[PDB]
Every structure is written in C-alpha cells, then in structure tokens.
C-alpha cells in the first residue's frame, strides 16, 4: 500500500530551535504576575510565601495548576471563580523528595512526573518496598493521554475529590501522607476515610493548600493491589476503582491491618472499615474470603435507584476485585 524505503530520513539535529530569546529570559527572576479579564483576576504566585499571603487575603481564591478540572467546571458546569491563583511556579509545590518513609511529590507535580519517578523507583528497589508505588502505576495505566498527564497535577486530582478518582482510593488505602499549609499553619495527615467528608469536599480549611504528598514504601509482610472498572458512563460517579492493602503479623498469614477503599460506590471515596475491622487477627484463607465478600456486599450495598445504576455489576466488581487481591496476596505469601 506504501513504500517506506522512499521516506525522508529523520534528522533530529535539524528540529526547530528552542527560542533563543526565551532562553535569555530564564535569567530574569520570577515575580508575581497579575492578569485582569472580563470576569476573572489571575495571580501567578512566584513564592510559597506569596501564595499563603494571597490565600489569607482572599480565602475564596481558586487554585489552578493544570486547569484540567477547573476548565471543565468553568465551561460545562458554568462555575465562575472571580479570583484565581496559579501556584505552578513555586519550587516547594514541584519538589520530588526521597525520604526514609517514602517518596514525596509537590502538589503541582504533573502525573507524568509522578509516573516517571515511580517507574524508576520500581525498577531499582526491591519488590517488597514498591507495593504501593506499583498500585499507583497500575491506576495510571489507561488513565489519560500523554497530553493530560503532562499538565494534570497530583494535588489537583486529590483535591478535585471526584467520587471516581482512581488515585484517592490508593492514597487512602496506603495512608499516603498529606502536608497541608496556610499562613501560620502546617500539618501532615495520613489520608483516611475522614479526608472526604462529602461530595467534592476535602478536610481542608478555606485558606489551606495541599503542599506535598508522600507515597509510602511498603514494609515487610505488606502487600498492595489496585483495580479499576474498564467502563465509565457518568461524568463523576459509578465507576468502581479501588486500592487494597494488607499488613500481616511478622512472617505470618495473620492479618494485622487491612484497608479496602473504593471509588464509584458513593458520592466520595470510601473505606469498607466495618468489613476490614472484623478481619483483624484472622488468617488469610477461604473463610476470610467468604467473610470479606459478605461484608462488602452489605457495607457497600447500593439501592436499586442509586445514582449511576449498573447496580449488580458494581457489587460484583467490589467482590471480584477483592478476589483478585486475595489470590495475589496468596501468590506473594508463597
């Protein structure tokens, strides 16, 4: 149909040059910028201090990094935010830090950057340390185009708090640590069920901004899986997605900790805490599989008229995903 032998060869040294004038401007120190529109004032914050001052002066000011969510809210939900602050330039919001407990990403780090860093960590570190990382990576597979992942921030996905976020269930199940700041405040909390109190809301004060996110190393006797539904039918509900973690007593099959967190089963990310609490000190066997499935079927039960429908399918996925986790943990145990 065509003849590749006749194609012009690629000469990668002959590509359009990066604008030399733009390169000369890299020396110019960053300063706060203000843009004024018909309806919106936009402040480009150059420093963390500037961000915290602005947020103290205008708590209602909306943060925008990648705009991959805000652009949707403004265009399709007719939301208007008269003041926007873009913190993308701020070094602290972009830092990738390797620590004793895990890998920290500034909240403005693009998902592409998260993916690259985590892929490197998985390639170099022992399997037993990278269980949570691998879960994040699985959720980032078949997630969005390279275009989206290059500008979509990690923090943006978290704080968007969509019921069907593929990342929040993994962060919740793993107790991923969130460092949160405002003028005169700084606190770090592991993500848990309390972090999402209601639809599209998080447990942040009106002034508070998410600074950094520490994704933990997995420990000995600790295993993780993440799964997600392969269809999406509503804008922000009814797509099952999950993170699952078990910690055993040293060298055993006896449950010490268990966390099963799901999106797409309610109007926020939730944890099947009643179900998992019942399994503490139990052994990883057929009885546990039965009891967990019984618990999930009850705890995450959906009304026939639940928003999003696909009621049977969603229930079946909650159990089927746990089944996959159950078998995977058995393979990892031995």
């Amino acid at each position: 149909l065509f003849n590749p032998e006749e194609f012009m060869p690629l000469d990668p040294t002959q590509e359009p040059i990066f604008p030399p004038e733009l390169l000369r401007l890299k020396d110019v120190p960053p300063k706060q910028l203000r843009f004024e529109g018909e309806r919106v004032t936009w402040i480009q914050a150059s420093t963390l201090k500037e961000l915290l001052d602005l947020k103290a002066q205008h708590p209602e000011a909306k943060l925008v990094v990648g705009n991959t969510e805000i652009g949707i809210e403004m265009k399709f939900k007719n939301q208007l935010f008269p003041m926007i602050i873009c913190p993308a330039w701020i070094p602290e919001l972009n830092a990738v830090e390797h620590g004793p407990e895990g890998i920290s990403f500034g909240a403005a780090c693009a998902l592409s950057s998260v993916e690259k860093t985590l892929l490197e960590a998985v390639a170099k570190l022992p399997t037993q340390k990278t269980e949570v990382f691998r879960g994040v990576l699985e959720q980032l597979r078949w997630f969005a185009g390279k275009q989206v992942k290059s500008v979509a921030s990690l923090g943006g996905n978290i704080i968007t708090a969509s019921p069907i976020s593929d990342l929040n269930p993994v962060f919740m199940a793993s107790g991923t640590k969130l460092t949160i700041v405002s003028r005169g405040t700084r606190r770090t909390v592991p993500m848990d069920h309390t972090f999402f109190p209601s639809y599209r809301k998080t447990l942040l004060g009106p002034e508070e901004i998410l600074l950094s996110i520490e994704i933990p190393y997995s420990r000995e006797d600790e295993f993780f899986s993440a799964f997600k539904q392969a269809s999406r039918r509503e804008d922000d509900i009814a797509k099952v997605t999950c993170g699952m973690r078990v910690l055993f007593q040293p060298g055993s099959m006896q449950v010490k900790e268990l966390a099963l967190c799901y999106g797409g089963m309610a109007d926020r990310t939730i944890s099947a805490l009643k179900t998992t609490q019942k399994q503490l000190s139990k052994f990883w066997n057929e009885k546990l599989l039965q009891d967990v499935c019984a618990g999930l079927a009850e705890e995450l039960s959906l009304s026939p008229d639940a928003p999003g429908g696909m009621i049977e399918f969603r229930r079946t996925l909650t159990l089927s995903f746990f089944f996959k986790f159950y078998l995977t943990v058995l393979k990892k145990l031995g």
Binding site: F2, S231, E234, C293
Partner: protein, 756 residues
C-alpha cells in the same frame, strides 16, 4: 492510468500539515458574528417563558432569535414535521428553542447559558417499550413476507423465540456540525460554507425558512472532518439557524457546535428492539423466521422510514429462508430525532439475524460455521424480497477467510485455552455479510457532474458528491484521468457547490463512487468526442495542442454528465422489482479473550476478506474496510449512550462515551480484498465499500458471546444448549453480569444461589 493503484488521498499531505481548510478554519469577516443554540432541558413540556434579560447583559451580546423572527416558514425537516425553533412545546431534551448571536463564540456561549426557560411538563415517552405501550408510532407497519410461515413452523424440529435490543450510536465525527452564512444584502442572496453531506437540502431548507427562491442560496462544501451519515440531514439544524442570524443582522454569522451540543442535539443511530421466532431442523437448516423490529426514531421522522426499509431488506443477512416475515415499526419518542449512521438500519437487522443464527447453532449442538455455511444462499438464489443474487461472492470470501485466518487450528487453540483457564476465556467467531447497493428511494439514484477544460489543458471537475474523508474526490480524479487518458496532475476538484451541480442527492448509501464516477465518466466521453477531430488532425500532438485547437475552432470545452441507476424500483405491494443494483460482500473472523472477573476483554486477532470488485484504489478501500470495521466494533462492544429516566443524555463527550481508541483495535488486524471479482454493474468494475464492512465488527461481539458461553460452562451450570440474552453493546457490564458465578450470585458470601 492510476485506477487500481494505491494513490494516497489527494489532501492527505495538507491534512498532516494543518493546511487543509475545514469550515471553521475559514477566516472570519471583520463584522462576522457567532451563534449559539438555546435548547430544551425537558423531554416534553410547554414553553411558558424565555427570559433573555441576563443574556442581554453579557458583553458583545447582539440578539436572541426565536420562531417569531423567521420571515418565511418555521416548518422544516425532511418530512416537514419539525420546527426551526420550537414555539409553544418542546418534545425532546436538546430541542432547539432559539439562538443567541454575539461578537465572539465565548460571548455567545456565556449568553446562551443564562437564557432562562420556564416549562410546564407533559407526559413523556422515552423508551421503545414506552412507545409500544402507548401506541406511539410514525406511520403504519412495514412488512416483507415470503412463503408460508404456519407451514414452515409446522415442519420445524425446533423453535426458538426471544427478544433482543441494540443500543444506538453517536457519530463522533471529529469535526462537529458547522455553518458560515454570508448574507449579500441583495435580492435575498446568501452564500453558505457548510460541513454537510447534503448541500441540496441545506439550500432548500435555508430558502424555505427565509421565504426566498432556491436560486438565491448558494451552498458550498469543500470537505467535512467526518460525516458518517450524521451530516446527511441533521446539519440543517445548525445551517438554518445561522442563516436566520445572517438574514436578521445583515452580518456574516457562524456556528460550530461543541461536542456536548452535537451529541445532544443532532441525533444518532437508531436503537432497535426485536422480537423474533425461528424454526429450524436438527441439522440447523432454517425453515421459518418471524421478526418484529421496532426502532427508536425520536421526535421527528427524518430518515427513520427508509432506515427501517433497509433493516427489513437485510434481515436475511446471507441466509436462504423459505418462510419469512419481517415487520417494522418506527417509535415516536421524546428524544432527539435519530438519523442516518453508516449502515442505515442494516447493521441492526444483520445483528438480529446473527443473534438467532447463533442460537440455532447452540440449540442444535453444532459448530456455528457449519450451520452458517449450510444456510448460506447460493449463486442465483432470490432474497426474501425476490431479488436475484448475481455474482454472490460470500462462499469465496468465506473459504479464503477460513484459510488465511487459520480458523480451524485457532479453534482448537481457543478450546485448549478454555480448558486451561478458569477466570479468563477465549472466543472465536466467523460471520459473513451482504449489503445492498443503492438508495432505497429510487429517485435519489441520480448523479451529476460538470467538467471544464481550460485553455492550458488543466481540467476542473465538479460533481454532486462531497468529501468527508472517504477519498471520493481522489477516486473521481483517478476516474477522470483514466477516462481522458491524461495524468492526474492535470485534473483538480476544488469543492462541491449548488451552483455547479444542482439537485444533488446527499453523499450517502455508499453509492457516490458508482454514481458520480459514471457522471464524471460521461462528461469525459463528451469532451473526448469533441476533441476527437483535433486528435485526428494532429495525432502526435499533445493534450494541450488538441485543447487549444478546439478552443480556437470555437468548440465548447465544458460539459455536464449525468447518471441514473437503471432497473430500480421495489414494490412492497408485489414484493418484486430491484431494491438494489448489486450487493457488496465480505467475511470477518475475530478472536477475543475476556476477563471473566471484570468483563474487560482483549481483541486478539481479526481477519477480513472483502469483495469490493476491482478496486479503484486498494489503499482507500482497505482504509474504508478498516474504519468501518472499527466503527462496528465500537457499536457492538464499546459505545453506550445513557439517558436519565427523565430522558436527558448523560453521555455527552469522550470521557463518558468511549469510541475505539488506538489500543482498542485487534492486535493482529488483517484485511484482504477479494481477487479476480470484477463487478460489471459499476464504474471500472469496482464496488461500493463505505458501509458494507461495518457490520463485520459484530464478529467481535459474537466472539465475546462464544467466550461468555465458555465462562458459563465453567461456573454457571451444565446446560450446553442454554440460550442467554446478550444485548448490544456488549460492554464490560453486560459481559461481567453474564459470567454468572459465585460472585454475581453472592454464593461466595455463603448464600445459596444460581451457580454450580
């Protein structure tokens, strides 16, 4: 002579460079305004007020248009049963009520959003079942019947009856609907640049709304970024509104729809419900078939009738059935009016056919390919509508596909896989198709061309067809070049326009190559006849010499050409007369692997053998087969439109409506064009290819169904001959729910339940 050569699409390089101009890429006039439609948020309601007070405060706001502003007629649509702008009552979510005009598209958007409508709800009918229960239909029952059904069912060893549903489909042309209208300010003259397959109806509908003669309206179509039938009629929703804005303001006006608007307003493929009963022998031979078809037509007729006719013409697929009755009813519902979509009712009827055929094989406990083969038409058989199948190439396609796909060896590997795997299963299916070639309405089978040869010998060809990616202009240039015996470099097609070729049929029914090819050919013959005396006097001279000599002897170098497809005219009263000119044929074998725990699946391998006659351009035709197949893949396995109980579309963009992606296609994807099968009935022995291959995407669906059957054998029960209902699309939800096991039943929780 490039006919039969894989010439790339003439505009491909400009498309790759971003130089090809689509409607909205045309520069704006200094004074050009923008229109945004204002549509209903209710399925069925009286309009009690429209409040534009907030819209008027938006910077750049110009005006709000409604029915009262129309100078001519507010009655529109193919069957004159629509409004341009709804006046008293809305009859679907997305029903156009009016439009905002503003100085920028951003401003038009802003203004339209704050237009407030007050409604009084009326009882709505959304579902096909809703419509049947309420006797809500357009027109009367359509029917084709042959033989003696009572006798056939008496002779049958086995009878299977059931119900089946196939969901609709959004066109998702990458370029949405758009029109620019330029009012000239003299005599009602208006010139429109439109993304449409139907310049003629665009022209006539604009003229009717304005109340001016059709000769005042000029419609121009350079190209569409996809059409797929969705621009055969429904483009006029945008065109007529933009024309009104141009008329009213005296400014140029344009509108391009955002995706969410387009999916809501413009209609899609018709959902179908079928109730069917098939009688057959223990051998799998069919002796009786009764199928009642119901389409969900939405809130106007549009092309719904002819779509159902095509459905009825295809309920046989490739199978001889001596006793047969097919009926069809068009459901009148409070949804956006459904329209043409590649296949035009064919894929739905063909899917229904393959579903009961799949059930015959299962019931008989026989290999599906054997039952299909046994029931296949032979050369010279009559269809259920009494048309003779001449040049019936399905057996050749079937045999070649079986061989090249290594079907039998792979069948054994699929079985081996299923023996060795508990929670994943493979499936493999081979399916034939035939697709009738011609508009079901005889008068649409006409085509015009206009050719000019300029004094430098360069040739400008105009024809009634439009380019929407299918390579029609490319093929026409190849045809003209062969016909005139000059290089393709000497020929050009610029656009499609109502002032060069009038009264054109829409570019549809897969027939454009056939009918415009003939018209172009005839125009070329006329030119050759006129040049012949000059060639005779100067036989070693050039084309350019002959052209100049003709010019200087005052011989006209401009001619029309015209073609009228012969011997067409089916009668539902006599069940006789040709419905089609000929049929296009093909066969596809697909293999899948399903995840029985999640409902996800992989498309492992697809092999296609398509009879496109002697191809004018194998590259373009293979492209048509692949693209059509993948759209069919989408229809049957990925694409799902979803509505609220109140009838409001939820799935309004790519985040919630999943068309096939790069990673969706079969890992091994093989297409072959059948060799040595010239078609005497069309231009240079070629065949129509546009729509015929789409149904072959169902091979993926029936492979999935095969896999589900293996899963049910593994975990559900012990009944080998069990029939279970699998509607289309076979989404992860439907696949997963069908793999009945300890999870679906909750038996894993300790409860008793309906698995083994």
């Amino acid at each position: 002579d490039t006919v039969g050569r894989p010439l790339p699409h003439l505009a491909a390089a400009m498309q790759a460079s971003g130089e090809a101009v689509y409607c909205d890429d045309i520069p704006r006039y200094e004074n050009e305004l923008f229109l945004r439609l204002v549509t209903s948020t209710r399925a069925h309601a009286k309009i009690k007020s429209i409040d534009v007070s907030e819209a008027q405060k938006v910077p750049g706001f110009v005006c709000f248009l409604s029915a009262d502003d129309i100078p001519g007629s507010n009655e529109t649509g193919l069957f004159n049963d629509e409004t341009v702008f709804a006046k008293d009552t809305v009859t679907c979510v997305g029903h156009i009520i009016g439009a905002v005009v503003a100085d920028t598209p951003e401003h038009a958007e802003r203004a339209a959003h704050v237009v407030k409508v007050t409604y009084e709800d009326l009882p709505a009918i959304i579902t096909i079942e809703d419509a049947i229960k309420n006797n809500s239909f357009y027109g009367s029952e359509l029917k084709i019947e042959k033989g003696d059904l009572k006798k056939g069912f008496s002779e049958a060893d086995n009878v299977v009856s059931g119900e089946l549903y196939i969901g609709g489909q959004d066109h998702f042309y990458l370029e949405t609907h758009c029109t620019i209208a330029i009012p000239k300010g003299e005599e009602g003259e208006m010139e429109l640049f439109v993304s449409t397959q139907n310049a003629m109806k665009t022209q006539s509908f604009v003229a009717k709304m304005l109340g001016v003669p059709v000769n005042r309206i000029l419609v121009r179509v350079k190209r569409m970024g996809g059409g797929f039938g969705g621009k055969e009629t429904r483009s006029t929703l945008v065109s007529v509104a933009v024309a009104l804005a141009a008329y009213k303001t005296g400014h140029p006006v344009r509108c391009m729809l955002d995706r969410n608007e387009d999916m809501l307003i413009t209609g899609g493929r018709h959902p179908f419900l079928a109730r069917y009963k098939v009688g057959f022998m223990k051998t799998g031979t069919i002796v009786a078939l009764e199928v009642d078809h119901y389409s969900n037509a939405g809130n106007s007729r549009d092309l719904s009738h002819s779509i159902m006719e095509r459905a009825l013409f295809h309920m046989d697929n490739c199978y001889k059935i001596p006793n047969i009755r097919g009926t069809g009813r068009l459901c009148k519902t409070n949804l956006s009016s459904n329209t043409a979509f590649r296949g035009f009712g064919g894929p739905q009827a063909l899917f229904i056919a393959e579903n009961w055929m799949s059930e015959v094989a299962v019931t008989c406990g026989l290999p599906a390919e054997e039952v299909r083969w046994k029931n296949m038409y032979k050369e010279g058989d009559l269809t259920h509508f009494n048309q003779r199948l001449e040049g019936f190439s399905v057996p050749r396609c079937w045999d070649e596909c079986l061989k090249s796909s290594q079907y039998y060896a792979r069948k054994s590997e699929v079985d081996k896989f299923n023996k060795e795997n508990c929670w994943k299963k493979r499936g493999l299916c081979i399916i034939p198709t035939k697709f009738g070639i011609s508009f079901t309405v005889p008068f649409l089978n006409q085509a015009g061309a206009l050719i000019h040869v300029y004094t430098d010998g360069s040739v400008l060809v105009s024809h009634g067809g439009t380019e929407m990616g299918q390579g029609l202009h490319t093929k026409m240039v190849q045809v003209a070049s062969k016909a005139l015996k000059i290089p393709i470099s000497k020929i050009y097609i610029s656009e499609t326009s109502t002032n060069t070729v009038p009264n054109s049929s829409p570019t549809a029914a897969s027939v454009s190559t056939d009918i415009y090819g003939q018209a172009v050919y005839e125009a070329c013959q006329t030119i050759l006849k006129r040049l012949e005396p000059f060639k005779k006097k100067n036989p070693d001279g050039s084309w350019e010499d002959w052209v100049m000599a003709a010019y200087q002897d005052r011989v006209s170098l401009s001619t029309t050409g015209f073609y009228r497809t012969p011997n067409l005219g089916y009668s539902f009263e006599t069940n006789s007369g040709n419905a089609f000119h000929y049929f296009t044929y093909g066969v596809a074998c697909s293999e899948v692997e399903i995840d029985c725990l999640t409902g996800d699946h992989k498309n492992l391998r697809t092999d296609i053998v398509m009879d496109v006659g002697s191809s004018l351009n194998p590259a373009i035709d293979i492209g048509q087969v692949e693209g059509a197949f993948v759209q069919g893949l989408g229809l049957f396995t990925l694409e799902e439109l979803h509505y609220s109980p109140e009838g409001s579309l939820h799935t309004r963009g790519p985040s919630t409506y999943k068309i096939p992606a790069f990673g969706s296609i079969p890992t091994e994807f093989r297409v072959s064009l059948l060799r040595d099968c010239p078609n005497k009935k069309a231009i240079y022995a070629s065949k129509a290819v546009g729509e015929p291959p789409l149904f072959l995407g169902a091979s993926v669906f029936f492979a999935i169904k095969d896999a589900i059957r293996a899963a049910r054998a593994q975990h559900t029960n012990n009944n080998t001959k069990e029939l279970f209902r699998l509607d289309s699309p076979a989404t992860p939800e439907k696949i997963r729910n069908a793999c009945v096991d300890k999870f679906t039943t909750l038996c894993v929780t300790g409860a008793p339940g309906n698995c083994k």
